[PDB]
Amino acid sequence: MLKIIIPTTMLLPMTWMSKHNMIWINATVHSLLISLISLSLLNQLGENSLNFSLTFFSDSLSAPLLVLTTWLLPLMLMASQSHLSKETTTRKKLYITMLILLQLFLIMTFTATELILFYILFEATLVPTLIIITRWGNQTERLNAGLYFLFYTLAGSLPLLVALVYIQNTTGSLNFLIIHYWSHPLSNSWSNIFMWLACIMAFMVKMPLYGLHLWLPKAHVEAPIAGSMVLAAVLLKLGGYGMMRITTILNPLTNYMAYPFLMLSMWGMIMTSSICLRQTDLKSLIAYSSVSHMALVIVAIMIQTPWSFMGATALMIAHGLTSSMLFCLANTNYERVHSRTMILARGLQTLLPLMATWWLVASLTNLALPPSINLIGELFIITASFSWSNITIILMGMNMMITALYSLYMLITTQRGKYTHHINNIKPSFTRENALMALHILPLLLLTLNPKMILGPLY
Amino acid sequence: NVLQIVRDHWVHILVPVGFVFGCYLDRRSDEKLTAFRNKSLLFKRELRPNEEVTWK
Amino acid sequence: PDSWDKDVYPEPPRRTPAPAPQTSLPNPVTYLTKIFDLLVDRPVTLAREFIEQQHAKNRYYYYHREFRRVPDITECEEKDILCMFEAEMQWRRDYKVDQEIVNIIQERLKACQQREGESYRQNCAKELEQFTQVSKAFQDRYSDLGAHYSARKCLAKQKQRMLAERKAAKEAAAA
Amino acid sequence: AFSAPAAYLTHQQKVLRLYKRALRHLESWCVHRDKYRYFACLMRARFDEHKNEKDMVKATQLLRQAEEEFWYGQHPQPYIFPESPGGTSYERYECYKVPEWCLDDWHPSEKAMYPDYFAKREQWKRLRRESWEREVKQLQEETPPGGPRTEALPPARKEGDLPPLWWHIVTRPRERPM
Amino acid sequence: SDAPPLTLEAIKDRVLYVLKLYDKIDPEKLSVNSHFMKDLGLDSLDQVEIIMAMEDEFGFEIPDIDAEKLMCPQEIVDYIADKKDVYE
Amino acid sequence: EHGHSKMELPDYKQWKIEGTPLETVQEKLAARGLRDPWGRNEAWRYSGGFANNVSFVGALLKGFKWGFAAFVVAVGAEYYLESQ
Amino acid sequence: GSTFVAYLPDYRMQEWARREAERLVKYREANGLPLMESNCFDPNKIQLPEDED
Amino acid sequence: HGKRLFIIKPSGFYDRRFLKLMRFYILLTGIPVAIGITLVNVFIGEAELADIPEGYVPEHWEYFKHPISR
Numbered sequence A: 001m002l003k004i005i006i007p008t009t010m011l012l013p014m015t016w017m018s019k020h021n022m023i024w025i026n027a028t029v030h031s032l033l034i035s036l037i038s039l040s041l042l043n044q045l046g047e048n049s050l051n052f053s054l055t056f057f058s059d060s061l062s063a064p065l066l067v068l069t070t071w072l073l074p075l076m077l078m079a080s081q082s083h084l085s086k087e088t089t090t091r092k093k094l095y096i097t098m099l100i101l102l103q104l105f106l107i108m109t110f111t112a113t114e115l116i117l118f119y120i121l122f123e124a125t126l127v128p129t130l131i132i133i134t135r136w137g138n139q140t141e142r143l144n145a146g147l148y149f150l151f152y153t154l155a156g157s158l159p160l161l162v163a164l165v166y167i168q169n170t171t172g173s174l175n176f177l178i179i180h181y182w183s184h185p186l187s188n189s190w191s192n193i194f195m196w197l198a199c200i201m202a203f204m205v206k207m208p209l210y211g212l213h214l215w216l217p218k219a220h221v222e223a224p225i226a227g228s229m230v231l232a233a234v235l236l237k238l239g240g241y242g243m244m245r246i247t248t249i250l251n252p253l254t255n256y257m258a259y260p261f262l263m264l265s266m267w268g269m270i271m272t273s274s275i276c277l278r279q280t281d282l283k284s285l286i287a288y289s290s291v292s293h294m295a296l297v298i299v300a301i302m303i304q305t306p307w308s309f310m311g312a313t314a315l316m317i318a319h320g321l322t323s324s325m326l327f328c329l330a331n332t333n334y335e336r337v338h339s340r341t342m343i344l345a346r347g348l349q350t351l352l353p354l355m356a357t358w359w360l361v362a363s364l365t366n367l368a369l370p371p372s373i374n375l376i377g378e379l380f381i382i383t384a385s386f387s388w389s390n391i392t393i394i395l396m397g398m399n400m401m402i403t404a405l406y407s408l409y410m411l412i413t414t415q416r417g418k419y420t421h422h423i424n425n426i427k428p429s430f431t432r433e434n435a436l437m438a439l440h441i442l443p444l445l446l447l448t449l450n451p452k453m454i455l456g457p458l459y
Numbered sequence B: 001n002v003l004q005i006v007r008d009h010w011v012h013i014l015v016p017v018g019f020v021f022g023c024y025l026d027r028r029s030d031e032k033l034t035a036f037r038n039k040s041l042l043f044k045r046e047l048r049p050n051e052e053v054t055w056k
Numbered sequence C: 001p002d003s004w005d006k007d008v009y010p011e012p013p014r015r016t017p018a019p020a021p022q023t024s025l026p027n028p029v030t031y032l033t034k035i036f037d038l039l040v041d042r043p044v045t046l047a048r049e050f051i052e053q054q055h056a057k058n059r060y061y062y063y064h065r066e067f068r069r070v071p072d073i074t075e076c077e078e079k080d081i082l083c084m085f086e087a088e089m090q091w092r093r094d095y096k097v098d099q100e101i102v103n104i105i106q107e108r109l110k111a112c113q114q115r116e117g118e119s120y121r122q123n124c125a126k127e128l129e130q131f132t133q134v135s136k137a138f139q140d141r142y143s144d145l146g147a148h149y150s151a152r153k154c155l156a157k158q159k160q161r162m163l164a165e166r167k168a169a170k171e172a173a174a175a
Numbered sequence D: 001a002f003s004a005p006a007a008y009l010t011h012q013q014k015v016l017r018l019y020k021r022a023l024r025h026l027e028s029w030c031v032h033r034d035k036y037r038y039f040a041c042l043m044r045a046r047f048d049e050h051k052n053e054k055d056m057v058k059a060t061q062l063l064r065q066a067e068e069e070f071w072y073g074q075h076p077q078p079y080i081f082p083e084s085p086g087g088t089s090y091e092r093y094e095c096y097k098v099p100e101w102c103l104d105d106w107h108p109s110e111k112a113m114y115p116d117y118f119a120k121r122e123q124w125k126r127l128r129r130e131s132w133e134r135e136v137k138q139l140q141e142e143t144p145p146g147g148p149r150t151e152a153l154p155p156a157r158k159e160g161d162l163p164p165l166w167w168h169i170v171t172r173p174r175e176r177p178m
Numbered sequence E: 001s002d003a004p005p006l007t008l009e010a011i012k013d014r015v016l017y018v019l020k021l022y023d024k025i026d027p028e029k030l031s032v033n034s035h036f037m038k039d040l041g042l043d044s045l046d047q048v049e050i051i052m053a054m055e056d057e058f059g060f061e062i063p064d065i066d067a068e069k070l071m072c073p074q075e076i077v078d079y080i081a082d083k084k085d086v087y088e
Numbered sequence F: 001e002h003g004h005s006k007m008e009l010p011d012y013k014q015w016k017i018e019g020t021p022l023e024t025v026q027e028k029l030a031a032r033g034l035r036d037p038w039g040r041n042e043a044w045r046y047s048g049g050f051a052n053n054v055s056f057v058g059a060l061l062k063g064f065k066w067g068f069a070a071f072v073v074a075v076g077a078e079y080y081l082e083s084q
Numbered sequence G: 001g002s003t004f005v006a007y008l009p010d011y012r013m014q015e016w017a018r019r020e021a022e023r024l025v026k027y028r029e030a031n032g033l034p035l036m037e038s039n040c041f042d043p044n045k046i047q048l049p050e051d052e053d
Numbered sequence H: 001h002g003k004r005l006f007i008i009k010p011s012g013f014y015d016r017r018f019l020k021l022m023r024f025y026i027l028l029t030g031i032p033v034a035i036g037i038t039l040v041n042v043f044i045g046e047a048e049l050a051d052i053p054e055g056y057v058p059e060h061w062e063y064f065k066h067p068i069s070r
């Protein structure tokens, strides 16, 4: 695994020893090459895992997340090139350093054979994101947003640490392989109930769970474009990955303890999809859509059936790509209009036709149009839920209908109708933005050809 | 021009070097996990006449 | 074709009727399929002959991997991690092979349904019975392990099932 | 559409609007032209019998019973001209309307085609640049203190002046740009 | 479509045609600049009827606010030309 | 290529109320003391090729004559051929 | 990278499992064995606890 | 009829340029890949399943059929 970690570390001295006007080119080229190298982790086994060493191991759940993490950095650099133009070389190098450190921590987090090492890196990712949000955000609310994004996380994560060390004091190890092979049932006890809660709540808060989702709209709205991209694409999936790893020690207590979270997610997906219908801000609408999709992923993980896990993996990958694309489109509009109010700039199809095509395809993938991987994950989760209980179909279908409604509402409001007359600074789309949009969308339509790459270890 | 563009493009070589160093370190770490090489019940194999180790 | 075993994937002897033209009017199907043959099948056949000779010039082989049998999870001590690893890998391989067996039987059933046409309800009882038996066995083995399944959970399920069977048999004997 | 609206509609304007609406809806009811002409002459007669009423209270009690009767018998599916706000081709060609400022973003290779058009466009832009400076002063001096009371604009007063705020009325895209 | 690009001459001729087919006006005294209220002695009901005839003959609707201040055939022609963007 | 033929309007004196339903409309209007002023504006709808109308059943039976003739010729020829 | 992913070798052993199932089904059909067994492990090598209830 | 009018529309230069660039680069790498793939399939062919000879242990890459996969 060092053949990916070491180049990502070398990205830092290369960035800091670069010319003042070569940082973006060098960073983009070498991050793309690192993505290409990481692409060879996809050759997974039907047996246990790719156990590289005592410290790092790869799995067909970890490999798609690793590849998406490596692929996201070049897109983040391309998106950040525009709004950082008027800023000094040292500060741009610091921004690229924060992005590189975030990638390094995420890469080490997804392999992380140890649960304490996983926790340490899973919490180390917090610092670069907070600095990016509270340093290079625009509005005055960013500081407040950062505070939320901080404390919520720690409010969930501090009990987990205690639980973790407690387990190693009883089991003797926190290695995931030993934990899986030596797993034992949890008796229905108050102590075991609180151990279950301490294990679950940390990952629940970062999905986020419906009741615990307040930090996400603030953090995603006030963050710069690279921050929003990394928050929606990779950082939300840490909770799902952690739950998928940790639910192996929580059986059979998950059967009883899953009910409040299942109800919260099943009702909150409807609530947040309905919230999307009445939203005056593009970024907030995209954030609430992310909350709905992650609610579906929470349901899938809580059901803990093979089809549930496959659907959850597919949906995590598809949502990451789609939400990053949607945020990039919103930012392309914002850098022209500087308002971030959906109703202000209207009828952009007549002025930006190719960008309108990008908007249409992004809305189509968000709408879960078959045979996209978005719908593959959606349908697998829905079928698993139907087997779990036939009444889930009402909530699932209502969520599908509202999702289509708000996706097409977002498309029609911004692209169709009549152009706003007083806005005359809508310049033609740059090659950088179109390239960014294509680099988001072609991986999705190309992954629909080989779904088993993103269906997880239970395929 | 040689000795001139090197002073301007020296940084580019670093990422590739890291990839090679990581591969070397991965192999070196592999060399410390040979306690069961050619000893698993599934792959107990009798060595070829001109073979030292089943895998490296 | 020899590319697959006829016994694993059986087919009926494929009886076909003979043309019995009761009128002298030329049916366009015959002439049209002859011109299709001339304009399509021969060039494709010749291209295949070219490709097959080129393949025959370079002949090399690949092998199907053989896996030895190892002790299963029952012959494993309660904390002996190495034997548990061996048994778990063997159990996962067996699970995959069982899935493929069910796939083969389902393919048989689908082929029967399409082939027998309007009388599939009677002329596919054999495949339905085979699929029912295989489905029952597969369900008894792997129905409810859920995600995070293992050989230990399958063994516990089997032990519970056969304890229930022993209790039922003892109740029947002492009835 | 073009004319600026007033603060209120006078009684005569209300009566004339009711006359037009009732005639159009009667045409919707009376499909054939001869039947429509007969009933429209009757309708005009029924308007005319109270043309000379001097009592404003009487005239306002009238037109009210009349609009109530209209709402009762108003043909819930009246005929609409296709381009009218309820027609079947109302805003059909708005997607083809492109603003004129977009031409400023054209590539020089695009402006190499159509050189005469862009030369005339440059002339128009220069005219706008000078006329605007004249227009601001003229509007400032002509507006009453405390702000405008009606959104009606004055014409040009001198020889070389252009009507104030003329650019976006003169440079409309077209009724059917494509 | 295949609709001819109508000109000012056609609009003027068609407006005068519709007006001469209104029998409350004698055609020989009609002129392009003749006022409806005073030069021809027509009531405002006659004026709104004339507007309706123009609408039905040109296939589009004139709004009440614009229609109620069209008192000459020439300015009716001008309004139609401005609405339809006629060159000559 | 478009329709540029310099179309000239017909004479306005050509249109009359006489011989149209507008005539009986004017008659019934005069029975109560009113007149139709826009009658001649609509005379062109009853004047030229629009003067003659066809019934609904007549519209349905658009080609019954020559089709019926073809039918009778065909049936007679078939009767002559099969009687052999 | 897409071409590389397309031509990745079968380390998941899909065709291997298919061939194993094919030969196993051929063997059991030939010998009249009841295809899949309901027991995953042999019962002779499991020691149940005697109840004596 | 010389009544040709100017059509006001946004610049299509940049969209066409981006599409041409993306098509050029994707083809620049994909055409050699397609030609090579076809050439490999046509002349190299594919491995045929065979029984393992006695006393011979195959390499790990000899258990695969497609030459590119091997």
Ligand SMILES: CCCCCCCCCCCCCCCCC[C@@H](O)O[C@H](CO[C@H](O)CCCCCCCCCCCCCCC)COP(=O)(O)OCC[N+](C)(C)C
Residues within 6 Å of the ligand: A035, A039, A064, A067, A068, A071, A317, A443, A446, A447, A449, A450, G001, G002, G003, G005, G006, G007, G008, H066
């Ligand atoms: C502009 C108008 C159109 C012009 C173009 C016309 C041509 C259109 C044709 C292309 C689309 C039509 C669909 C037809 C597909 C043909 C190719 C397909 O069949 O090959 C696929 C093969 O492709 C791959 O399966 C999918 C590509 C994998 C995508 C990887 C993403 C690239 C990395 C980018 C970074 C990652 C970001 C996202 C993180 C998760 C599936 O093949 P498969 O039967 O299965 O096995 C391959 C061959 N074997 C048998 C030898 C093994």
Ligand SMILES: CCCCCCCCCCCCCCCCC[C@@H](O)O[C@H](CO[C@H](O)CCCCCCCCCCCCCCC)COP(=O)(O)OCC[N+](C)(C)C
Residues within 6 Å of the ligand: A188, A189, A190, A193, A209, A210, A211, A212, A257, A260, A261
């Ligand atoms: C706010 C946004 C979302 C945040 C996250 C919300 C999710 C948290 C929900 C917690 C999951 C369940 C907690 C406890 C479940 C135990 C089962 C219980 O509900 O049922 C009865 C439990 O009975 C009563 O609940 C006893 C406890 C009563 C006191 C609880 C307070 C009630 C409301 C508090 C909710 C506030 C939550 C937030 C706190 C800050 C059954 O009684 P009994 O069969 O005999 O005992 C079963 C337990 N045994 C077997 C271990 C002994």
Ligand SMILES: CCCCCCCC/C=C\CCCCCCCC(=O)O[C@H](COC(=O)CCCCCCC/C=C/CCCCCCCC)COP(=O)(O)OCCN
Residues within 6 Å of the ligand: A152, A155, A156, A159, A162, A163, A166, A190, A191, A192, A194, A195, A196, A197, A198, A201, A205, A212
């Ligand atoms: C987003 C903000 C959420 C904030 C955190 C939410 C998670 C809360 C989970 C509990 C926190 C601490 C739990 C302890 C960690 C696990 C350790 C464990 O399981 O050991 C238990 C110990 O169990 C406890 O001590 C639990 C005591 C909890 C005290 C703190 C209560 C916090 C609030 C309680 C109400 C809310 C609970 C769920 C809230 C969910 C989040 C909203 C048994 O060990 P022993 O006692 O040594 O062995 C038994 C024989 N003696």
Ligand SMILES: CCCCCCCCCCCC(=O)SCCNC(=O)CCNC(=O)[C@H](O)C(C)(C)COP(=O)(O)O
Residues within 6 Å of the ligand: D011, D012, D013, D015, D016, D022, D025, D026, D029, D046, D047, D048, D050, D051, D052, D053, D059, D060, D062, D063, D066, D067, D069, D070, D071, D073, D074, E043, E044, E045
């Ligand atoms: C078929 C659909 C339903 C139809 C039902 C509707 C029933 C409507 C009938 C009601 C009768 C009335 O007129 S309601 C009576 C309203 N009041 C008056 O008429 C008082 C003075 N009249 C005016 O001022 C007019 O404008 C006039 C002088 C005519 C022109 O003026 P010009 O000189 O400035 O054109």
